[PDB]
Amino acid sequence: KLVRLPGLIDVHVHLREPGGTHKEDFASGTAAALAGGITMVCAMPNTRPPIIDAPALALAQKLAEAGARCDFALFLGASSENAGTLGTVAGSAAGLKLYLNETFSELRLDSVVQWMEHFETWPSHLPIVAHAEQQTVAAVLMVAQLTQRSVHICHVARKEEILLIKAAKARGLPVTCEVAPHHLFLSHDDLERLGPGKGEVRPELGSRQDVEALWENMAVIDCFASDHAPHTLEEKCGSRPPPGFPGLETMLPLLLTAVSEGRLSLDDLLQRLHHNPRRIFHLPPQEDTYVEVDLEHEWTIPSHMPFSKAHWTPFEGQKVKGTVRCVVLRGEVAYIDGQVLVPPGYGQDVRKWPQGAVPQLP
Amino acid sequence: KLVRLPGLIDVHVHLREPGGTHKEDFASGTAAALAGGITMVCAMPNTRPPIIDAPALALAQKLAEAGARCDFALFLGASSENAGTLGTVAGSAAGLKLYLNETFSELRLDSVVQWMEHFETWPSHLPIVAHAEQQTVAAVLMVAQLTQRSVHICHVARKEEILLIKAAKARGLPVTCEVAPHHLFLSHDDLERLGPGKGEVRPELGSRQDVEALWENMAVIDCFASDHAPHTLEEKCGSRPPPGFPGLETMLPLLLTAVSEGRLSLDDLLQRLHHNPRRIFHLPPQEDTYVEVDLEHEWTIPSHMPFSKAHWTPFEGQKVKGTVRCVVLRGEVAYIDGQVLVPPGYGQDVRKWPQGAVPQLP
Ligand SMILES: NC(=O)N[C@@H](CC(=O)O)C(=O)O
Ligand SMILES: NC(=O)N[C@@H](CC(=O)O)C(=O)O
Ligand SMILES: [Zn+2]
Ligand SMILES: [Zn+2]
Ligand SMILES: [Zn+2]
Ligand SMILES: [Zn+2]
Ligand SMILES: [Zn+2]
Ligand SMILES: [Zn+2]
């Protein structure tokens, strides 16, 4: 007896194309998405070249249109030089991503004044998302208030951060957030098994108390998003390991396991992987699109999932219950039981669909 | 320059068929919906016969399929006798409506124990909505906690009620709510103009402080819904006036006026008339469906709107800015500039669409 779900949306993935295609490309990353029950992805801009101007956006759009197997939108990234220059292409992007801490990125902003400039110049009706850890959450929330607009906080990982956001929501402030599976299902207790290379990720893995605080405050979490951040094992275990975990193929099985245990409901899951991604990012429906899952099947996560080029996973050895059996995307079978059946290029940029433009005042 | 909006959803309308068709029927009520930029409606069960058993549901479904011009779902109503009897038809309804106070309804529940019985027997994955005023909000919230499930509060009208819901949300409780336009745009100050017959409505009109509290707490309001409750003028001004206002044709023009004044944003409006109705009630997208509005057009609400058989309005004389120019429903022009162009019966029961069933565990 299979359960039919709507097409799930991951608003935070790194697909590494252009410029890092040994780690992942559009074709392999979207195969991993479909195998994880995800039919739409929002791809982050910290590629090489990074997506921080109109020519880079145009290049990435064509590469995505040619390689993606599921539908997508592409973020623009904020830089120290591009505030006020993105107005003509802003509406074609998923939103604007701000990198406000140290991580796998050179998109460094040196000054809060640069954050203010982006919040003042980016069109007020379009999404802004931030990599903002610990006190940086409070600081970017301040900039959002000074400029009278909303902000979405990426991968919330700490009790400190979820309680701050909770207090902001109680004051009626327009803030939303997402949480990634590794911050719900891994902790400091896993660092000995993972080791210091594989274990590198930003935000870093939390304490057991951090993990328990996220679960206790599920009502504060608007979205789940993988922060799929593939790097090869060689890279993860070498002299200067980059931060990040792959996670498209494991996120839904982990969360379905939690549903089966009563830790959250099926509805709680669908709000956070479908309805709230849709409404925060104004993403369009996908016609004739659905995901069929088997909630009874027990398996153990292996040393690598089939599709991501990362060819490793930090969830190796975890027992899960739940698996993706079939994905239909816009009327075509896209995935069955380990086989992807739509080619590179089947996927489309949802911001070009008439129903995918963000409504605005004339 | 027109603005294109998605198909808007009104989760609280009274279409009076079967049994009250001099006040409204499916054809006239859904014409009023389309003229108000609404493409999907959830119809309440306090008809004659009321929709409280499978035979009444089957009758209403056929009448709606034959008369509706826009798409719809039909609520079931809770009674003192039907707890535990609705399991086979529950998934075909919009949800279950509980009438917990005195209003235009005989669906009286005598005891909180009856509320508990409904919360225990209605399928836990399906919506429950309540007419619950003042302390009744707190009481039904208690029953929802005792039975470990969610509840949606209809037409919140008072500072007391919105602050209670605000405090519940801060504690992480699964409660959502809607507000009707007359509780945002009318108050006690209008009772002298309206008089005691026309002014009758449940919840009654609030004080200026009630209205200001709803606006101040917009972040707490999940949905706008009209509580379109048509009665004829003769009925409203006779010896025992029934409570209720018509409102499908005026709700969006009133709210667009507020947007133009900066009282809320276009996004705030779309969350509350599209995204959150979708996600609370698991309502499906409508393909090739959109509403085109003109935000510049200034007009004054007349003594009656063109389509509702109520043939009166409590908003007569209010100056508004914003009007519905065109509605396209599933690829057909449904409304242009005062003309409805889809016939009775064009509309469909969204719960019969594959994507309109509420997902559940096997
Ligand atoms: N999360 C990570 O550890 N790395 C991300 C960057 C990011 O999201 O910070 C990546 O792109 O590798
Ligand atoms: N709101 C009203 O005053 N009347 C409603 C019933 C209701 O929603 O209470 C009606 O159906 O007439
Ligand atoms: Zn393509
Ligand atoms: Zn990040
Ligand atoms: Zn990231
Ligand atoms: Zn029909
Ligand atoms: Zn009511
Ligand atoms: Zn009502």
Given the CA of residue A103, which atom of ligand 1 is nearest to it?
A: 9
Which protein residue has the closest C-alpha to ligand 1 atom 8? A227
Q: What crossing angle do the helices spanning A159-170 and A135-146 adopt, rounded to 10°?
A: 30
A239, two tokens: 């002299």
What was the experiment behind these coordinates?
A: X-ray
Distance from Cα A176 to the centre of ligand 4, integer Å: 15
Q: Is residue A356 part of a domain?
A: no
Q: How far apart are the first and last CA of chain A?
A: 49
Closest CA to B94 of B57, B139, B51, B43: B43
Q: Length of chain A, please?
A: 362
Query: If 0-12 CB within 10 Å is exposed, 13-18 middle and 19+ buried, where does residue B254 land?
Result: buried
Q: Is residue B362 part of a domain?
A: no
Is the bond preceding residue A203 a cis peptide, omega within 30 degrees? yes
- Are B285 and A285 a contacting pair at CB < 8 A? yes
Residues with Cβ within 8 Å of residue A232, at least 6 apart in sequence: A22, A23, A309, A310, A311, A312
Answer whether A266 touches B (CB < 8 Å): yes
Distance from CA of B103 to the nearest CA of A (A): 32
Query: What span, in angstroms and rounded, lies between the C-alpha atoms of B41 and B52?
Result: 19
- Are A4 and B295 a contacting pair at CB < 8 A? no
- What resolution in angstroms does the PDB record give? 1.5
Query: What span, in angstroms and rounded, lies between the C-alpha atoms of B74 and B94?
Result: 5
- Cα dihedral sign for B223, A127, B294, B255? positive
The residues that bridge with A323 in the sheet, in sequence order, are A294
Q: Is residue A361 part of a domain?
A: no
User: Which strands form B8-13's sheet, in the order they lie side by side?
Assistant: B8-13, B38-43, B71-74
Q: Is residue A139 part of a domain?
A: yes
**What number of other Cβ atoms are within 10 A of residue A168's Cβ?**
21
Closest CA to B5 of A284, A359, A124, A91: A359
- Are B276 and A276 a contacting pair at CB < 8 A? no
Residue B46 assigned to a binding site: yes
Q: For ligand 1, is residue A97 a contact (CB within 6 Å)?
A: no
Query: What span, in angstroms and rounded, lies between the C-alpha atoms of A106 and A47?
Result: 10
Which residue from A103, A228, A236 has its CB within 8 A of the most atoms of ligand 1, so it is best to mutate?
A103
Q: Which amino acid is at B253?
A: P
**Angle made by CA atoms A220, A281, A104, in degrees to the nearest 5:** 80
> B362 contacts in A (CB within 8 Å)?
1, 3, 295
Q: Which amino acid is at A106?
A: E
Query: What span, in angstroms and rounded, lies between the C-alpha atoms of B153 and B223?
Result: 10
Q: For ligand 2, is residue B244 a contact (CB within 6 Å)?
A: yes
Q: Is residue A52 part of a domain?
A: yes
Residue B188 assigned to a binding site: no
Q: For ligand 1, is residue A244 a contact (CB within 6 Å)?
A: yes
Three-state secondary structure readout of chain A: CCEEEECEEEEEECCCCCCCCCCCCHHHHHHHHHHCCEEEEEECCCCCCCCCCHHHHHHHHHHHHHHCCCEEEECEECCCCCCCCCCCCHHHCCCEEEECCCCCCCCCCCCHHHHHHHHHHCCCCCCEEEECCCHHHHHHHHHHHHCCCCEEECCCCCHHHHHHHHHHHHCCCCEEEEECCHHHHCCHHHHHHHHHHHCCCCCCCCCHHHHHHHHHCHHHCCEECCCECCCCHHHHCCCCCCCCECCHHHHHHHHHHHHHCCCCCHHHHHHHHHHHHHHHHCCCCCCCCEEEEEEEEEEECCCCCCCCCCCCCCCCCCEEEEEEEEEEECCEEEEECCEECCCCCCCCEHHHCHHHCCCCCC
Q: Is residue B361 part of a domain?
A: no
Residue B214 near residue B233, CB atoms below 8 Å: no
B212, two tokens: 């200001």
Query: What span, in angstroms and rounded, lies between the C-alpha atoms of A29 and B269?
Result: 35
Q: For ligand 2, is residue B24 a contact (CB within 6 Å)?
A: no
Answer whether A362 touches B (CB < 8 Å): yes
Answer whether A360 touches B (CB < 8 Å): yes
Three-state secondary structure readout of chain B: CCEEEECEEEEEECCCCCCCCCCCCHHHHHHHHHHCCEEEEEECCCCCCCCCCHHHHHHHHHHHHHHCCCEEEECEECCCCCCCCCCCCHHHCCCEEEECCCCCCCCCCCCHHHHHHHHHHCCCCCCEEEECCCHHHHHHHHHHHHCCCCEEECCCCCHHHHHHHHHHHHCCCCEEEEECCHHHHCCHHHHHHHHHHHCCCCCCCCCHHHHHHHHHCHHHCCEECCCECCCCHHHHCCCCCCCCECCHHHHHHHHHHHHHCCCCCHHHHHHHHHHHHHHHHCCCCCCCCEEEEEEEEEEECCCCCCCCCCCCCCCCCCEEEEEEEEEEECCEEEEECCEECCCCCCCCEHHHCHHHCCCCCC
**What number of other Cβ atoms are within 10 A of residue A175's Cβ?**
22
The tally of CA atoms less than 13 A away on the side-chain side of residue A281 is: 38
Q: Which amino acid is at B168?
A: A
Query: What span, in angstroms and rounded, lies between the C-alpha atoms of A101 and A202?
Result: 9
User: What's the structural domain count of chain B?
Assistant: 1
Query: If 0-12 CB within 10 Å is exposed, 13-18 middle and 19+ buried, where does residue A298 land?
Result: exposed
Residue ranges making up the domain that contains A105 = 3-348
- Cα dihedral sign for A360, A362, B3, B4? negative
Q: Is residue B208 part of a domain?
A: yes
Answer whether B266 touches A (CB < 8 Å): yes
Query: What span, in angstroms and rounded, lies between the C-alpha atoms of B333 and B326?
Result: 8
Residue B178 assigned to a binding site: yes
- Are A5 and B285 a contacting pair at CB < 8 A? no
Alpha-carbon separation of residue B46 from A154, B26, B197 (angstroms): 45, 14, 21
Query: What span, in angstroms and rounded, lies between the C-alpha atoms of A7 and A37?
Result: 7
Query: Phi and psi (nearest 5°) for B272?
Result: -85, -15
- Are B3 and A361 a contacting pair at CB < 8 A? yes
Is the bond preceding residue A49 a cis peptide, omega within 30 degrees? yes
A198, two tokens: 């594989």
**What number of other Cβ atoms are within 10 A of residue A361's Cβ?**
12
Residue A12 near residue A42, CB atoms below 8 Å: yes
Q: Which residue has the tokens 């509309």?
A: B347
Q: For ligand 2, is residue B353 a contact (CB within 6 Å)?
A: no
Residue A31 near residue A307, CB atoms below 8 Å: yes
Closest CA to A101 of A201, A10, A14, A198: A201
Residue B75 near residue B44, CB atoms below 8 Å: yes
A97, two tokens: 């991503």
Distance from Cα B325 to the centre of ligand 6, integer Å: 24
Query: What span, in angstroms and rounded, lies between the C-alpha atoms of A235 and A284?
Result: 36
Q: Is residue B300 part of a domain?
A: yes
CATH number at residue A127: 3.20.20.140
- Cα dihedral sign for A131, A286, A275, B328? positive
